[PDB]
Amino acid sequence: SINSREVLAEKVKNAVNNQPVTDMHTHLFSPNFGEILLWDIDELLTYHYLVAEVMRWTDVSIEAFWAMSKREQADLIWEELFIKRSPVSEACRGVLTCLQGLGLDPATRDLQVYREYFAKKTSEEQVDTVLQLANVSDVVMTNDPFDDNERISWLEGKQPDSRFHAALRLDPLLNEYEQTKHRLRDWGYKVNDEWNEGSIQEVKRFLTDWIERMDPVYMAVSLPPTFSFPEESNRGRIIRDCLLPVAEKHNIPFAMMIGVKKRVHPALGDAGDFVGKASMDGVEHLLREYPNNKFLVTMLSRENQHELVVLARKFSNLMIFGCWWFMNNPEIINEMTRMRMEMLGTSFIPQHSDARVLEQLIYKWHHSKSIIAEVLIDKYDDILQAGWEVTEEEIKRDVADLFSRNFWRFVG
Amino acid sequence: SINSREVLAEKVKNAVNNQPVTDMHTHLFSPNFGEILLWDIDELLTYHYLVAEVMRWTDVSIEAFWAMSKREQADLIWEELFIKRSPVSEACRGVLTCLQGLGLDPATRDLQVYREYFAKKTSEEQVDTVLQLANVSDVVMTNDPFDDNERISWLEGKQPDSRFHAALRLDPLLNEYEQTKHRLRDWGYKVNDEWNEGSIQEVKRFLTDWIERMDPVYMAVSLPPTFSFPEESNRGRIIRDCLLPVAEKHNIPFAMMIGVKKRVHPALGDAGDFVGKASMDGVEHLLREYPNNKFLVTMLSRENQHELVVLARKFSNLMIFGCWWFMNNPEIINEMTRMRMEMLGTSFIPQHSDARVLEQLIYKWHHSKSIIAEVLIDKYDDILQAGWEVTEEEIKRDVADLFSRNFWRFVG
Amino acid sequence: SINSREVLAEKVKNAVNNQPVTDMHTHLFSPNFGEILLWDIDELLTYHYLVAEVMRWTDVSIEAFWAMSKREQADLIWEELFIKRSPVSEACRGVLTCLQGLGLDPATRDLQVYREYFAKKTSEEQVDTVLQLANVSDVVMTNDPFDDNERISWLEGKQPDSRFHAALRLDPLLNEYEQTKHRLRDWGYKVNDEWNEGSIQEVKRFLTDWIERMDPVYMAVSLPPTFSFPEESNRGRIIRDCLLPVAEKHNIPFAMMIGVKKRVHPALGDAGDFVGKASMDGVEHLLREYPNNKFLVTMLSRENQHELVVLARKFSNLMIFGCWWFMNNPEIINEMTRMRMEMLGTSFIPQHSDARVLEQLIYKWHHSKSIIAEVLIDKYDDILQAGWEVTEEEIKRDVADLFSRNFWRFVG
Ligand SMILES: [Cl-]
Ligand code: NA
Ligand SMILES: [Zn+2]
Ligand SMILES: [Zn+2]
Ligand SMILES: [Zn+2]
């Protein structure tokens, strides 16, 4: 069987590369939703990650940059980040990995040629190509019923194809209730100005109608470093009186992405969000006091990772997932995954892509799978050295859990 | 001499493997204490570490689990964590390492056969076997005069054999004084309800009588993330008015294990403790204001490790030790030991086992020694490359300090 | 071209070793300043880093140590840290690396011979030797107009040679204004007891006169973990009403070294400073509200590093630099540099020496360059594997930025 690191390394890498991936959180959409689905070499280069980076070098003002056309911005970013300096950053490295995967050749640095490749395909075609290259079988979307464009599709009866699943984003409802309350009553949900039984019932109705319309795998929200629960606030009262009860009834997990400090640099748009360490008290309280509720959690601060792992050791109704945003870097992904496996075995979800542009699925999963594989190799090899015997079939099983089964199993 | 990494690597590993270990903190007992000393493949599998992990997978309710028999629980944990998924976690890896060390063969996964091995031995026999395999020469125990069972032995005149040393655990006195005060006066220590000269003298008497009865290498307590000193509280007043003065007089170190948040998940029993980052202010104050007192410290939060190292650079009356609990994982042990050696040389104690079940001493020390060795190899090799010459005898000396001499030297 | 890791590794290491270094922060002085410039094997051994370490081992009281002569202290430290135990610590390793670089041989452990080497050279000669060995082209000093000795040189018209640049240290003005205000009015700066327009104008005049007299590359200050801004305090008012306006007018960057907790152990002198994690709020506020001001920042806490990197992604007027003090260790330098490059590409300054003794420049840069090189090799190799082609000339360019261009470019 397997009784050599070399043999093991090969079996593991294969299992990992071949395993069909369920990306449980992304910003992609079923191609039939139209425009909202982004793909293009230009889309890749104008990803907010690179906008932030380009602004550290270029002399072009942020206003001017926003004034430029998508292609113009893409030309500037390519010049500033790939030509004037080596594309060593993770985000840049990712653009190259995408090109290479599609069959293009970074060696030539021919942006005009790369562009021609996309110009002759359709959304549906690129989707099949990318999902095939990245070996992604299922894509969970981020569906926000507060976005006018997005809401049209849903109200018109449009459904995503079997490859894409919905997830109900509630940020506007939980974090901006004072403004959102108006739009609710505007849509027929008679919430009053004061928080009473009437408002509670309507907000629950709102949630139920959308759960019914989207059939989401989970409801989610991104929270600031200062998040706490319980709390006398709109968010605290809504989570307690509406979200949790509804989620328990429909057995839908509540996904919390904690740690983002919104718009510390407004002019940068989506590139202007920062990070902060959060207290674990609110998450600990939710897990303990709501045993019949399920929670998916990922945190933005490097300093929250270890304790999050320990918290998962305490509560089975907590499923932690991915290396989110500023954590989505080789150095962090490696330390996070090792700490996670060492204390949780395989009872967690290693990664998600958070892709905003279709092609990212390629590098996102390529870059992470190689790291995850190395970790697996070390852990399998360690028990192997302890005289334990791992079969290739067990490896495929474990890998199946990490990249797909654990999620579906949890969302039950 | 040694002028090749390969040569060095061999000399170092040998020195490390051969060096007799003094485990300065465990939850083991001199076999003559009877039952309290745990050993068994079943004991290993039901270690709270694995209980936490199994609960993340199994459908068996926590109540049912506690309802099961030791063997039943052990069967469930083996099935859920070793058969249904690969035992890649550190705690699981450790069980295998123990089996292999005793001569059993994990390859067969024959739990019934492994069990037979233990069924035919006596406590005294297993002790000699394990201590020999783990190459542990001395074991410091955790002796709590507040536990009825444990207190019987001491009051009956029972003494541990020369291989086991006592350590006075004071958690109940320091963290639960309101409840403990009653038991004290119950034992003849006339402490009053209010904290006055009378109460102070009696608590000191209590400490002195037990110091005299146990001849402990140190007095110890585990503290929450919110620990602070000075503090107007029972703990603060007791440490100031009684513990520190008595410790100085008898020249006994005060061991503080900081960072545990007790019972965040009650149902899990010993598996329900969490972690939190602590402020260094209290430790800094103690070290500076009590120069004639010695302090042994270990912290639970990953985020406290680096600053703890720096604090050790400031005060020689501080001796830091081990990679405690949630820190006892390869990824953390490696980063901790490297930061420690880089800033403290060899003036610290790398590890302790915290073993609750006898056999753990095997993997606990096996897993850590390999990591510590790798660190040593890198550090010796670095000065070697700088034209310095290290003798095998110097290596044995350094290794002697790390695994035994530093502790005994500090406890003077 | 370069299409093999081995080939790449060689090209990178060469580029790194050959690249002339601009050390943007040190405690060295142009030799013509005289005594203040420290150099010697004895100076190296009595560097506060080793004083802290020796005190963890030796029985010599701290008073006695301070009573000893420089040579006596150097003998004690050598015996205690190099002979009685292996010099595995980073600071010790550094002393050896220095010896070896100067051509001496650590293998003999002949302290008396090493000493003879220095006894026959002059300041000017050692400077040329060291700067040549360390391949350092430019050295930024720390110039404090509050130190009497240092202030004499400046008032006497003494200028440093083209290799040394001035940096205006303002700690006494910002952190000890209540005491410093007296010395100011003492020097003709008519600041009143209360903070009014008069005081503001005089403090600005003070800053302007010294900017004019030193022509500094930046103004700097070291701050405590509790640093915050805005703040109703002398520091907060001085930064707002004087420092920032003057800095904008003269386009001089403001360098903040955050995280030092001064004198937690007074007796240890310069060896008695501790560390603490800081809030990023003050830095975030400064960067956002003063877009026309430039900021150089380095932090002392390991727990501030990642977020500092993310903050740099948000603001181009923020330039982060080095692995400061307790961060200047292999384990930390590696994690810091990897996180930095992964999120910032090459838009940052990897390291500075902080040398207090001339020869340190040798090991300081030797130890860091090897680590930085390894990171570069991994990042170049990663894009190489993505089909990108890096030329040796591009590598030399990138390396030029990291070790010199980014700084000068930023200080404009
Ligand atoms: Cl932290
Ligand atoms: Na690491
Ligand atoms: Zn997202
Ligand atoms: Zn313990
Ligand atoms: Zn400095």
Helix/strand/coil (H, E, C) string of A35-51? CCCECCHHHHHCCHHHH
Q: Please, how many CA atoms are within 13 Å of residue A146, restricted to the half-sphere of its CB?
A: 20
- Long-range contacts of range A388-393, CB-CB < 8 Å, 24 or more positions apart? A388/B87, A388/B96, A388/B106, A388/B107, A389/A1, A389/A2, A389/A3, A389/B106, A389/B107, A390/A1, A390/A2, A390/A8, A390/B86, A391/A1, A391/A2, A392/A1, A392/A2, A392/A11, A392/A15
Q: Do B365 and B21 contact (CB within 8 A), yes or no?
A: yes
Residues of C with CB below 8 A from A271's CB? 313-314
CB count within 10 Å of CB A390 equals: 22
Among the partner residues C310, C339, C347, nearest to A274 by beta-carbon distance: C310
SS3 state at B385: coil
Classify residue B241 by its DSSP letter: I
> For C301, which residue in chain B has the nearest alpha carbon?
B307
Q: Do B296 and B255 contact (CB within 8 A), yes or no?
A: yes
Helix ranges restricted to H, C290-403: 305-314, 330-344, 360-384, 392-400
What angle do helix axes C197-214 and C177-186 make, rounded to 10 degrees? 70
Q: Please, how many CA atoms are within 13 Å of residue B8, restricted to the half-sphere of its CB?
A: 21
Task: Return the partners of chain B (3 or more C-beta pairs < 8 Å).
Answer: A, C
Q: Which helix (H) or strand (E) holds C406?
A: helix C406-410
Boundaries of every domain in chain C = 1-37+120-143+328-412, 38-119, 144-327
Ligand nearest to the CA of A298: 3
Residue-wise burial string across C175-199, b where 16 or more C-beta atoms lie within 10 A, e elsewhere: bebeebbeebeeeebebeeebeeeb
Check CB contact under 8 Å for B394 and C86: yes
Expressed in angstroms and rounded, the spacing between residue C220 Cα and the centre of ligand 5 is 10
Phi-psi domain of B68 (left: phi exceeds 0; alpha: psi -120 through 50; beta: other): beta
Q: Do C263 and C278 contact (CB within 8 A), yes or no?
A: no
Among the partner residues C52, C86, C271, nearest to B398 by beta-carbon distance: C86
CB count within 10 Å of CB B367 equals: 22
Mention every residue, 6+ apart, whose C-beta is less than 8 A from residue A105. A99, C387
Q: Please, how many CA atoms are within 13 Å of residue A378, restricted to the half-sphere of its CB?
A: 17
In the beta sheet, which residues pair with residue C171? none
Residues of A with CB below 8 A from B86's CB? 345-346, 380, 383, 390, 394-395, 398
Q: Which helix (H) or strand (E) holds C318?
A: strand C318-320
Expressed in angstroms and rounded, the spacing between residue A26 Cα and the centre of ligand 3 is 6
Query: Exposed, middle or buried: residue B52 (CB in 10 Å: 0-12, 13-18, 19+)?
Result: buried
> For A288, which residue in chain B has the nearest alpha carbon?
B265
Q: Do C280 and C255 contact (CB within 8 A), yes or no?
A: no
> For A97, which residue in chain C has the nearest alpha carbon?
C386
Phi-psi domain of B263 (left: phi exceeds 0; alpha: psi -120 through 50; beta: other): left
Q: Do A169 and A140 contact (CB within 8 A), yes or no?
A: no
A43 is in an annotated binding site: no
In the beta sheet, which residues pair with residue A254? A219, A295
Residues of C with CB below 8 A from B343's CB? 89-90, 326, 329
> For B337, which residue in chain C has the nearest alpha carbon?
C331
Task: Return the partners of chain A (3 or more C-beta pairs < 8 Å).
Answer: B, C
Expressed in angstroms and rounded, the spacing between residue C326 Cα and the centre of ligand 5 is 12
Check CB contact under 8 Å for C57 and B382: no
Radius of gyration of chain B (CA): 22
Mutate to test the interface with B, among C110, C226, C263, C264 (most CBs of B within 10 A): C264
Interface contact A274, partner C, CB < 8 A: yes
B202 is in an annotated binding site: no
SS3 state at B382: helix
Q: How far apart, in Å, are the Cα atoms of A374 and each of A72, A380, A381, C361, C399? A: 39, 10, 10, 37, 29
Check CB contact under 8 Å for B342 and C90: yes
Query: In whole angstroms, what is the distance from residue C301 CA to residue C278 CA?
Result: 8
Check CB contact under 8 Å for C398 and A86: yes
Ligand nearest to the CA of B260: 4
Check CB contact under 8 Å for A93 and C383: yes
What is the distance in angstroms between the Cα of A221 and the nearest Cα belonging to chain C?
Answer: 22
What is the distance in angstroms between the Cα of B52 and the nearest Cα belonging to chain C?
Answer: 28
Check CB contact under 8 Å for C387 and A107: yes
Instruction: Tell me the technique behind this structure.
Output: X-ray
Q: Specify the amino acid at residue C398.
A: D
Residues of A with CB below 8 A from C397's CB? 85
Check CB contact under 8 Å for A99 and C335: no
Assigned token pair, B245: 């003065």
Q: What is the 3-state secondary structure (H, E, C) of chain A?
A: CCCCHHHHHHHHHHHHHHCCEEECCCCCCCHHHCCCCECCHHHHHCCHHHHHHHCCCCCCCHHHHHHCCHHHHHHHHHHHHHHCCCCCCHHHHHHHHHHHHHCCCHHHCCHHHHHHHHHCCCHHHHHHHHHHHCCEEEEECCECCCCHHHHHHHHCCCCCCCCEECCEECHHHHHCHHHHHHHHHHCCCCCCCCCCHHHHHHHHHHHHHHHHHHCCCCEEEEECCCCCCCCCCHHHHHHHHHHHHHHHHCCCCEEEEECEECCCCHHHHHHCCEECCCCCHHHHHHHHHCCCCCEEEEECCHHHHHHHHHHHHHCCCEEEECCCHHHCCHHHHHHHHHHHHHHHCCCCECCCCCCCECCHHHHHHHHHHHHHHHHHHHHHHHHHCCCCCCCHHHHHHHHHHHHHHHHHHHCC
Check CB contact under 8 Å for B338 and C326: no
Interface contact C277, partner B, CB < 8 A: yes
Check CB contact under 8 Å for B342 and C326: no
Specify the pairing of strand C136-140 against strand C164-165: parallel
Expressed in angstroms and rounded, the spacing between residue B26 Cα and the centre of ligand 4 is 6
Among the partner residues B88, B329, B332, nearest to A380 by beta-carbon distance: B88
The candidate with the shortest Cα–Cα distance to B187, out of B206, B212, B200, B201, is B206
> For C81, which residue in chain B has the nearest alpha carbon?
B345
Q: Please, how many CA atoms are within 13 Å of residue C288, restricted to the half-sphere of its CB?
A: 19
Ligand nearest to the CA of B26: 4
Query: In whole angstroms, what is the distance from residue C85 CA to residue B398 CA?
Result: 6
Interface contact B344, partner C, CB < 8 A: yes
Specify the pairing of strand C254-258 against strand C260-261: unpaired
> For B398, which residue in chain C has the nearest alpha carbon?
C85
Among the partner residues C311, C376, C382, nearest to A274 by beta-carbon distance: C311
B354 is in an annotated binding site: yes
Q: Do B170 and B219 contact (CB within 8 A), yes or no?
A: yes
Among the partner residues C335, C347, C390, nearest to A331 by beta-carbon distance: C335
Residues of B with CB below 8 A from A391's CB? none
Residues of C with CB below 8 A from A56's CB? 312-313, 316, 344-345, 347
What is the distance in angstroms between the Cα of B14 and the nearest Cα belonging to chain C?
Answer: 17
Domain A38-119 matching CATH 3.10.20.30: the answer reads: no
Interface contact A195, partner C, CB < 8 A: no
Query: In whole angstroms, what is the distance from residue A169 CA to residue A255 CA?
Result: 9
Residues of B with CB below 8 A from A386's CB? 93, 96-97, 99-100, 106
Residues of B with CB below 8 A from A312's CB? 56
> For B314, which residue in chain C has the nearest alpha carbon?
C272
Expressed in angstroms and rounded, the spacing between residue C379 Cα and the centre of ligand 2 is 17
Residues of C with CB below 8 A from B316's CB? 55-56
Which residues of C line the annotated binding site for Mg(2+)? 331
Mutate to test the interface with C, among A79, A331, A371 (most CBs of C within 10 A): A331
Backbone angles phi, psi at A61, to 5 degrees: -65, 155
CA distance from start to end of chain C: 35
Check CB contact under 8 Å for A387 and B57: no
Listed by number, the residues of chain C in 40-79 with a beta carbon closer than 8 Å to a beta carbon of chain B are 52-53, 55-57
